[PDB]
């Protein structure tokens, strides 16, 4: 499922990401734009067994188990296929686990390189919450 910017925002806000650890809502929408271009089916193989899954691209060696990655930690105690759904819940819950603080969105290089420092709020302006 490919989300709209406003629809993705509303779902994120409904799940408690708006101002989570002090990160305003636009950060999350901007991260999703760059990580999976708003696509819940997104996937990406890395130069190591690991693959990143879903809307926020969660890694298979550290967060979700894909039962195929060598050295998987499964810190979100969830199967990577769970992260490939149209309901963002499982993805929002693991990301909340990943962002343990006010610097935690660095867990996403795209956010760090393409969002951080820019008017991320431009992504939610004009959206019904």
């Amino acid at each position, epitope marked *: 499922k490919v989300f709209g910017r406003c629809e993705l925002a509303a779902a994120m806000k409904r799940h408690g990401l708006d101002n989570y650890r*002090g990160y*305003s809502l636009g950060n999350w929408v901007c991260a999703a734009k760059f990580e999976s271009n708003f696509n819940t089916q997104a996937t990406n193989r890395n130069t190591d067994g690991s693959t990143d899954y879903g809307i926020l691209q969660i890694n298979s060696r550290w967060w979700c188990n894909d039962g195929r990655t060598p050295g998987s930690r499964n810190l979100c105690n969830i199967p990577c296929s769970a992260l490939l759904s149209s309901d963002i819940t499982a993805s929002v819950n693991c990301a909340k686990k990943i962002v343990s603080d006010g610097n935690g969105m660095n867990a996403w290089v795209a956010w760090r390189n393409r969002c*951080k*420092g*820019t*008017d*991320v709020q431009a992504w939610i302006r004009g959206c019904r919450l």
Partner: antibody, heavy 116, light 107 residues
Framework: QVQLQESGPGLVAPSQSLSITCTVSGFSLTGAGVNWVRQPPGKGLEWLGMIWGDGNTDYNSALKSRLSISKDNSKSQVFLKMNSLHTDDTARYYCARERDYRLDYWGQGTTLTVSS | DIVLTQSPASLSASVGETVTITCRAS??????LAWYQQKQGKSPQLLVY???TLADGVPSRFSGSGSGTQYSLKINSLQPEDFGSYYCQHFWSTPRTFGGGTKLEIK
């Protein structure tokens, strides 16, 4: 340690063009925006403009045509330039770091006086 | 632009009292509102951001609230070091504007 320090001329005639510098440290200019604010003697805070981490700039509607903000990421300096000076431009000038929609760190300010 | 109307202009209070400063926005700012404290001869200091979030190091006696267009800063059991000026600022799009300031002084 995040630090912001302003440097400026102190006194200027309308016959000149004002430039103030904001040297920062402790953080990168690519990942944070820097705002410019002034406070006239015994007055409140007035927002002048800003430069985003990406280099885009936004300005105060009334002051737009007299202001120009730019920066040098390698020198870690942000600049405010202003022309058509008036006695009303006399104030203390501040640069402040913007981190996700809040000015969390401020410079000490430089005082400017516009002569005759 | 969105203008912010802050009241009251000054407030005289005693230590231990609870006060409230308000800022009303001319347009919906959707919670993008911060509060700053400025003591005599110092530069502004962030207190609260995103309407209710306290800056690190800021004491719990401060709390903000509001939505849409009316926002409040409440100070409970105000202490000697709380005296000074207070300003609100909105961050909804650009240009950003500040409230006119409130001077909190000793009774």
């Amino acid at each position: 340690q995040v630090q912001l320090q302003e440097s400026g001329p102190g006194l200027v005639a309308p016959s000149q063009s004002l430039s103030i510098t904001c040297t920062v440290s402790g953080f990168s200019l690519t990942g944070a925006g820097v705002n410019w604010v002034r406070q006239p003697p015994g007055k409140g805070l007035e927002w002048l403009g800003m430069i985003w981490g990406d280099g885009n700039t936004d300005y105060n509607s009334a002051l737009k045509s007299r202001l120009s903000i730019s920066k040098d990421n390698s020198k870690s300096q942000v600049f405010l330039k202003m022309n058509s000076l008036h006695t009303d431009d006399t104030a203390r000038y501040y640069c402040a770091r913007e981190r996700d929609y809040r000015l969390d760190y401020w410079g000490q300010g430089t005082t400017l006086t516009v002569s005759s | 632009d969105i203008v912010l109307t802050q009241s009251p202009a000054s407030l005289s209070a005693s230590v231990g009292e609870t006060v409230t400063i308000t800022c009303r926005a001319s347009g919906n700012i959707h919670n993008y509102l911060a509060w700053y404290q400025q003591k005599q001869g110092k530069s502004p200091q962030l207190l609260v951001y995103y309407t209710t979030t306290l800056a690190d190091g800021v004491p719990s006696r401060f709390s903000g609230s509001g939505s849409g267009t009316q926002y409040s800063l409440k100070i409970n059991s105000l202490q000697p070091e709380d005296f000074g000026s207070y300003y609100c600022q909105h961050f909804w799009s650009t240009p950003r504007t500040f409230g006119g300031g409130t001077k909190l002084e000793i009774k």
